[PDB]
Ligand binder design. Sequence first.
Ligand SMILES: Nc1ncnc2c1ncn2[C@@H]1O[C@H](COP(=O)(O)OP(=O)(O)OP(=O)(O)O)[C@@H](O)[C@H]1O
Ligand SMILES: Nc1ccc2ccccc2n1
Length: 517
Amino acid sequence: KETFYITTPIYYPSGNLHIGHAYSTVAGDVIARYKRMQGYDVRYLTGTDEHGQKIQEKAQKAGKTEIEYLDEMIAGIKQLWAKLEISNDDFIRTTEERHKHVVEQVFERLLKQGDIYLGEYEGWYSVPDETYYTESQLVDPQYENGKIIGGKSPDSGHEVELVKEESYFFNISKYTDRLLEFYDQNPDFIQPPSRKNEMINNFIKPGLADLAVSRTSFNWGVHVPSNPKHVVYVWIDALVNYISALGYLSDDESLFNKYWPADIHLMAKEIVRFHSIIWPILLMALDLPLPKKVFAHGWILMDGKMSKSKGNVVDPNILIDRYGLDATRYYLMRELPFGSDGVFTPEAFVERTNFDLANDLGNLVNRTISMVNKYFDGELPAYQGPLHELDEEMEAMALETVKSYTESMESLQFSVALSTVWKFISRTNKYIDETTPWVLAKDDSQKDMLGNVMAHLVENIRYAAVLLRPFLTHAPKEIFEQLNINNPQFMEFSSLEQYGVLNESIMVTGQPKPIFP
Ligand SMILES: Nc1ncnc2c1ncn2[C@@H]1O[C@H](COP(=O)(O)OP(=O)(O)OP(=O)(O)O)[C@@H](O)[C@H]1O
Ligand SMILES: Nc1ccc2ccccc2n1
């Protein structure tokens, strides 16, 4: 059993998670389920990032300890994943010891080695944006004696002021040629291609500046063992969740020894830099193998991209409660091409939900069961061969739909994988219009052919349902329940290699009802 390790990022609970966080986690579950159906030993991880100055500020505002603020927020997040039916194998929290021990030890090791050195951090903080800007990338600069003394933010235009404190730095520039050599040896490391260019051209080529990895202005966080005044900053703390959750540096490294390196790291494009540059360099200094792929998908837009800070938010609980689980998951995996951006509209949601699920697929199944109940009393005839003339091309189309499904899935374009599946569904509906089974019913002479048409409809659906198990968690099962396919074998990918596995007659449901919501 070949291992496949997949991770989502660890999300910051400064506020409630929205459809964008859902979108990443949902995509990871799709890969996880897909990969399990191909017979991999899968580990899929998600988690939270629980340290920093902001978690004090939100917890002390609500009137509670930092941890009992987090406990509430994590309980709400675990609930959202359970409701989305995320098949994550673990939840990692940076506030738990298996993580904290690893951050402590990695920091000291890089201190021992001389990768890290004590210095002073200098930057420009904007209160509105909650972002730190460098001297150079500042806009509308003010000079006093020829040095920038004050300025504006690039992204808002609010006044900033300098921040200066003691900080440990990670000298990463010496790993630059090792890192570029890594990109050349592993040409699919950064996905998609667009993001790899902007990594080389905008960060590495200018010169990778030393990285401020610790702070003194707050206390909530992992403290540096050799210097308690310093508390570890976001990069080293958060990034090592991918390995700490596997029991790295613990009593039991068995999960680390078998699952690391990561087959794929999911994220949105704002943090590709830390996964494709800093994370591989950190692992080099730890002398550990690098991840095999980092994937940055696009943004859900609204005004701007969806953020919890700015409130332009859609709660996935509202969408699931209203329109259903399978609709919500479908919308996220269908409307935005993996890697491109896209704008959310509740009108686009409802059209996807209705036109594809309810009207194309839901109606296909209902007509097919209805007709089988009508003409053969519920007793579906067995498969034999491509007796109708449309069947040669259509039986072949089934197989080619799986070939095209696979490569869209391997290459991570699930929107295209889903649209290819739906092309087959739409054609299955057309086959009813083309064959006209109601005309075949009148002649008792036409009985094999009328049976063949139903056998082809049912098999066409089988294929679609089978291929949709990674995406939709109720819909496939409900279709199998109503068709009354029973052995698990015909729900797996293997059973799609040769067309027409049902050569035994089966009694479909006498009471078909809507598949969705
Ligand atoms: N609009 C979005 N589209 C896609 N993924 C998103 C989006 N917002 C959040 N994510 C997911 O969460 C990760 C980081 O979350 P992030 O802190 O940026 O969310 P946020 O709501 O923008 O937070 P903040 O309020 O601090 O800006 C992304 O890498 C991605 O996995
Ligand atoms: N460990 C740590 C410190 C500060 C943070 C700020 C923002 C996100 C995560 C953080 N983690």
